[PDB]
Design a protein around this nucleic acid. Structure first.
Lengths: 386, 109, 172, 63
RNA sequence: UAACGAGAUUCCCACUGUCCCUAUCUACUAUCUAGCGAAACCACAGCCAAGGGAACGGGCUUGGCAGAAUCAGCGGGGAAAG
RNA sequence: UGCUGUAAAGCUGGGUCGAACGGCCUCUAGUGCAGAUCUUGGUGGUAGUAGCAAAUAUUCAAAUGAGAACUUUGAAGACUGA
RNA sequence: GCGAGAGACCGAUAGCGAACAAGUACAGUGAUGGAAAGAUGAAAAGAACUUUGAAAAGAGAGUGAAAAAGUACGUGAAAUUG
């Protein structure tokens, strides 16, 4: 018999299976389509979710009640120290899909990226890439041969770049190494750009502009094993139900004599790989700026860091990206920032953003001062100050 | 490296007993102190002075002090079979306040 | 008594027995299989680490709905345990057989556990009390343990012969 | 090393409950040989067995 | 028919997680370990679809398929057990 | 280990074992088991699984001892609360 | 009941309920109900002594025609197990 009353189903079938991500680093499933006319530029970057903050902004949206009126918005900070190019990979079109043909590494690799290849670094002889480094013996003709192979045969060129995690407050010493597709120009141009950038740093300023819409690739917050009521948002059973109420009452009809895949079951929650799209870049701050959090209206000599630092992160002392809203992942998560896959001409996307003020009160409590100087001015001298 | 050595430590028992069942806080402070001494003396054999047991339990089963000053001395175990060459002895130090004290090596004289 | 397996050379072997031992049979079988074929001194170090929870006994047959652990990777399994009562009996019989071999003049450094096996012993019956006034069984499953330490033309046809002979003539 | 009997005897000789009997932990051999009430009396007189003071219940706040 | 009622019923005020619509917290379990250690039940066993068939198959016929060993849950089926 | 017989079965090689037993002609019967929610006894899978969770709460040391969460003693912390 | 002699009777789940300290152990307020349980060897000759172990035991040895007879005792099947 039919349901007495119709209702939409709980949860999406487009995000099954709700299992843990295979890797903690989010991987870019798809890169922006390559346009030969454009200049050779990267398409993705790796940063670290520092924390959330608050901004104030005059909304520029004609026809809205908030047009030319201040809006308070949540923002997320992504600590993005420059990435180091260490390798280049060539991909060949085949009837069975893209296939990596050749990988060429840089002559010298930093220790933090060589740790990536070790599960027990402290007990190793640290032999990684030693013979390969020797392959640069005064002529590097093997490297040139591989680069010529990539130029001749490859159709997609990606660059192997790693983060400089030692510049972040994280205690992890392994760098994060990822493939970033290179767009623009011919394959020869892409390989020349990759070779000319070995062991060099690339900053976010050369990848992302302000007011851009970008995508965020990350693994969400884990919650462990979870019941159907919170995992799927189903209705709790009445109070007087025997054997408990945080269940789904009927998990199927008699026929099919099986449990359907579309029925909500308890299982692992969170820690899923997610791609979130259309996040506006409110700010691209520089680590060398001593007034990161200062705007054209709040000239306070102020960094992006709140009072007491970011809770469970530390301080953002590097170049950073300030994005609108929330992104998947937790604090300290490595986050992949990708360029938009399509051209959005909507007013929300083409808007120019000018920030009025950035919140730097302590996140560790009901903070009520933006700066220690402000705190002292408001409170006066304390007993510890003498 | 000297095997026989005496030092005074401050243990932040408050952060170690966080969230612990109220009827186990003093029992767990005994286990935490034993685990603390192994971290420093490298010995699985830790002996607690009975006066230390009095100090832990002086305010009932959940009134463990936030900080305790301990004098941990590593001694040689002559017993055979010892199966643990050294052992740690923990006995309490009476101080007016347990705040602002650093680790100090004690000279047995 | 007759042991299940007789040693190939009785002069280079020593045996130990334990009967009606009140230890779980299923636990003892797994701990006996974990050291079968090992060096005697190698197995004694292993059995001490199992008591310390540094290494585990892989449970291979009697392992239904037991926990998973990382210490089972040493044996390529996911289910392993640290059965103390079973390890202590086995260590007792290993020490007896080692002392048996020393009295023979054998060398403990060269001893190998060539044969160890566990059999069922007669059960011990107790009672448990169930709802609605019912009595069930509460038996024990004892073990018999025994272990032994050891030191470490062609005929051809007429025409097969004929073919062979004629080929040999070709080669001078 | 099983002074359960001696503590029961000492409670009756002293006239208090077993909760108020103190057996010297250093005199275990001496107390273990005190099998009779006569032997318990000597240990009580010598101080090997001590009648612990009653726990104080002050009436000061009631007053 | 006053009074009385762990009697049945309707409405009103108060009150409230009964609900919108859930969330968080604590103890004891469950979980993992050492020791101890049952019972119900059991033809053989245990993946689906359709067919025909004692007219609702785990097995038969025709297809889909199909890769050791498993852990925590769960309550569709075993026309589950009693 | 084989052989014989369509079969019911019979005979044999090897091993174990220790005191009686067979063929043939007849006689006789409490004479042939897979089932009876059969009877009695035994043994499994389940399964090292369910579980061993009410009654506030235990800890340190010494002794004894092959061995001590559980015995004794001391110190403490508790409770029953006439 | 007492005392004898026999059998094409049964042969330890059979034969009396009882081949045994059987109308016993045990159950029930009571009337009553009511089992299980035979076999080392010719003879205990029932394992002295040494060794490992806290001990039980084990390994040697010894007795014996046999320990493939060790009182958990003739043979020692099947289920089930190593």
């Amino acid at each position: 018999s039919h349901r007495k009353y119709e209702a939409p189903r709980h949860g999406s079938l487009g995000f099954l299976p709700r299992k843990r991500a295979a890797k903690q680093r989010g991987r870019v499933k798809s890169f922006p389509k390559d346009v030969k006319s454009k200049p050779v530029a990267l398409t993705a970057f790796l940063g670290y979710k520092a924390g959330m903050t608050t901004i104030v902004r005059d909304l520029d949206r004609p026809g809205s009640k908030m047009h030319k009126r201040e809006v308070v918005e949540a923002a997320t900070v992504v600590d993005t120290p420059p990435m180091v190019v260490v390798g280049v990979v060539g991909y060949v079109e085949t009837p069975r899909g893209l296939r990596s043909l050749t990988t060429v590494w840089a002559e010298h690799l930093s220790e933090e990226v060589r740790r990536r290849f070790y599960k027990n670094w402290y007990k190793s002889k640290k032999k990684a890439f030693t013979k390969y480094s020797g392959k640069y013996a005064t002529d590097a003709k093997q490297v040139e041969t591989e680069l010529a192979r990539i130029k001749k045969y490859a159709s997609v060129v990606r660059v192997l770049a790693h983060t400089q995690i030692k510049k972040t407050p994280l205690s992890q010493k392994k760098a994060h190494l990822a493939e970033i597709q290179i767009n623009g120009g011919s394959v020869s141009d892409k390989v020349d750009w990759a070779k000319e950038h070995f062991e060099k740093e690339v900053s976010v300023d050369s990848v992302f502009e302000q007011d851009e819409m970008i995508d965020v690739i990350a693994v969400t917050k884990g919650h462990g094993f979870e019941g159907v009521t919170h995992r799927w948002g189903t209705k709790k059973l009445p109070r007087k139900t025997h054997r408990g109420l945080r269940k789904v009452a009927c998990i199927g009809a008699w026929h099919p004599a099986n449990v359907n895949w579309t029925v909500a079951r308890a299982g692992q929650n969170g820690y899923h790989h997610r791609t979130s799209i259309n996040h506006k870049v409110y700010r691209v701050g520089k680590g060398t700026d001593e007034a990161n959090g200062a705007t054209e209206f709040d000239r306070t000599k102020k960094t992006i860091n709140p009072m007491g630092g970011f809770v469970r992160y530390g301080n953002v002392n590097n170049d950073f990206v300030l994005l609108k809203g929330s992104i998947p992942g937790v604090k300290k998560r490595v986050v992949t920032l990708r360029k938009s896959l399509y051209v959005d001409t909507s007013r929300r996307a083409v808007e120019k953003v000018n920030l009025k003020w950035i919140d730097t009160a302590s996140r560790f409590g009901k903070g009520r001062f933006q700066t220690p100087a402000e705190k002292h001015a408001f409170m006066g001298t304390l007993k510890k100050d003498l | 490296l000297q095997d026989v050595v005496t030092r005074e430590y401050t243990i932040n028992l408050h952060k170690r007993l966080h969230g612990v069942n109220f009827k186990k806080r003093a029992p767990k402070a005994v286990k935490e102190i034993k685990k603390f001494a192994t971290l420093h003396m490298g010995t699985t054999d830790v002996r607690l002075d009975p006066k230390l047991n009095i100090a832990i339990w002086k305010r009932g089963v959940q009134g463990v002090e936030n900080r305790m000053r301990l004098r941990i001395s590593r001694k040689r175990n002559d017993e055979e079979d010892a199966k643990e060459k050294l052992f740690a002895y923990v006995e309490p130090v009476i101080v007016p306040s347990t705040k602002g004290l650093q680790t100090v090596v004690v000279e047995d004289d | 008594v007759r042991y299940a397996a007789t040693p190939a050379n009785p002069a280079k072997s020593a045996s130990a027995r334990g009967s009606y031992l009140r230890v779980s049979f299923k636990n003892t079988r797994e701990t006996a299989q974990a050291i079968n074929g090992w060096k005697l001194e190698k197995a004694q170090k292993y059995l001490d680490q199992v008591l310390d929870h540094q290494r585990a006994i892989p449970f291979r047959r009697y392992n239904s709905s037991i926990g998973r652990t990382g210490q089972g990777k040493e044996f390529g399994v996911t289910k392993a345990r640290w059965p103390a009562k079973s390890v202590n009996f086995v260590k007792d019989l290993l020490r007896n057989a080692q002392a048996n071999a020393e009295a023979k003049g054998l060398d403990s450094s060269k001893l190998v556990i060539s044969h160890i096996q566990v059999n069922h012993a007669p059960k011990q019956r107790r009672r448990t009390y169930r709802a609605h006034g019912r009595i069930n069984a509460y038996q024990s499953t004892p073990s018999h343990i025994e272990l032994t330490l050891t030191e470490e033309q062609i005929r051809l046809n007429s025409r097969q012969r004929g073919r062979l002979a004629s080929q040999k003539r070709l080669t001078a | 090393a099983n002074l359960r009997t001696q503590k029961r005897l000492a409670a009756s000789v002293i006239g208090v409950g077993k909760r108020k009997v103190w057996l010297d932990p250093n005199e275990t051999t001496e107390i273990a040989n005190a099998n009779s009430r006569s032997a318990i009396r000597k240990l009580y007189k010598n101080g090997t067995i001590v009648k612990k003071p009653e726990t104080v219940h002050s009436r000061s706040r009631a007053r």
